[PDB]
Design a protein around this ligand. Structure first.
Ligand SMILES: N[C@H](COc1cncc(/C=C/c2ccncc2)c1)Cc1c[nH]c2ccccc12
Lengths: 20, 336
């Protein structure tokens, strides 16, 4: 399930901003 | 509304043109605990001795800010924060600087990040997501009316207060602009196609981020994710979006228009402005005035055993605050 794929991804923690 | 905004702009402008400066000293606060850490700064819980109040103090290392070329963005943040005032914006109480750091003391929101709550519970119901989303709608209406673009919307930057309402924080990317801007900034999952394509953008990017926020709040995961930013950016510009089975027909409709890759018809950036959003089916039951007054029943009240409590916040390695005996970047930060 998409829920499962999300929890298994490396993007469930606090996401950092970008610029450079 | 138009009546409210008009007067709001008057107060903001006076402050914007004559920013308060150096309204406190480091030695007037007691260091309690670190609440977050970033590349050029950190946020700590502190206790103000005179009043016995607890505050969140954002400390930025001037040298690291310069290395990361965020000087102007930092000046933008403070100048804007000391001038705004809205029920859903965390209040800046004091600001000052010393030889090494810049300091911004804000009101403490013990409830914690929406992020933490959202992840623990999985997803919020639609009435729940609608309650929070409505607060962002009015906040963006407010900010934009002042020619301010937020550019940093995400669950990580939303705090939940004692009344259960949201408090937006982190104005690191906020900027006052009329017309287009070009800085590549934000968070991968939340970037509008215009930003990734590097082609001059306006406040429409905030409304797009609202689209991402609502989806994540209601689904439990963002509409666009993958382990590599590139991979995430490919999905955002594709013009493709999948919606969970439980999403209501209206919600899917509100999101199709918000996550519109064609910013020349994306809700919020149309002739009707924000009203295309406020008068949409999914918000039919929302009493916008009730939300601003905070007279609506909150879907959840965070708990705390007392002021100063930090259990709604993660633990972070406690590092020491040093201040060199030599001024570091005076000129660059003179107006702060
Ligand atoms: N995302 C964390 C916290 O970020 C911020 C940023 N600005 C204001 C608050 C405000 C937090 C807060 C907490 C409780 N009550 C009131 C306000 C929190 C680390 C982080 C990412 N970029 C940063 C840049 C500078 C310092 C830290 C970070």
């Amino acid at each position: 399930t998409t829920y499962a794929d999300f929890i298994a991804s490396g993007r469930t923690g606090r996401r950092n901003a970008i610029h450079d | 509304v138009k009546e409210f905004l008009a007067k709001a702009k008057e107060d903001f402008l006076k402050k914007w043109e004559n920013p308060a400066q150096n309204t406190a000293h480091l030695d007037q606060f007691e260091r309690i605990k670190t609440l977050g850490t970033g590349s050029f700064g950190r946020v700590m819980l502190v206790k103000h001795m005179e009043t016995g109040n607890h505050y969140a103090m954002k400390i930025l290392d001037k040298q690291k800010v310069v290395k990361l070329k965020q000087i102007e963005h930092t000046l933008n943040e403070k100048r804007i924060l000391q001038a705004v005032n809205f029920p859903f914006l965390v209040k800046l109480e004091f600001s000052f600087k010393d030889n090494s750091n810049l300091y911004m003391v804000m009101e403490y929101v013990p409830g914690g990040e929406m992020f933490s709550h959202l992840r623990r519970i999985g997803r919020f119901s639609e009435p729940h997501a609608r309650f929070y989303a409505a607060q962002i709608v009015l906040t963006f209406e407010y900010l934009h009316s002042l020619d301010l673009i937020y550019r940093d919307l995400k669950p990580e930057n939303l705090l939940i207060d004692q009344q259960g309402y949201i408090q937006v924080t982190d104005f690191g990317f906020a900027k006052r602009v009329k017309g287009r801007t070009w800085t590549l900034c934000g968070t991968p999952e939340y970037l509008a196609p215009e930003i990734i394509l590097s082609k001059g953008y306006n406040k429409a990017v905030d409304w797009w981020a609202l689209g991402v926020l609502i989806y994540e709040m209601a689904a439990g995961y963002p509409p666009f994710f993958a382990d590599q930013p590139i991979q995430i950016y490919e999905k955002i510009v594709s013009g493709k979006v999948r919606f969970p089975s439980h999403f209501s027909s209206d919600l899917k409709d509100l999101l199709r228009n918000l996550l519109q890759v064609d910013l020349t018809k994306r809700f919020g950036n149309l002739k009707n402005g924000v009203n295309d959003i406020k008068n949409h089916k999914w918000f039919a039951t929302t009493d916008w005035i009730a939300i601003y007054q905070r007279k609506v029943e909150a879907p959840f009240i965070p708990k705390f055993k007392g002021p100063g409590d930090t259990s709604n916040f993660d633990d972070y390695e406690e590092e020491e605050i040093r201040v060199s005996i030599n001024e570091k970047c005076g000129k660059e930060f003179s107006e702060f």
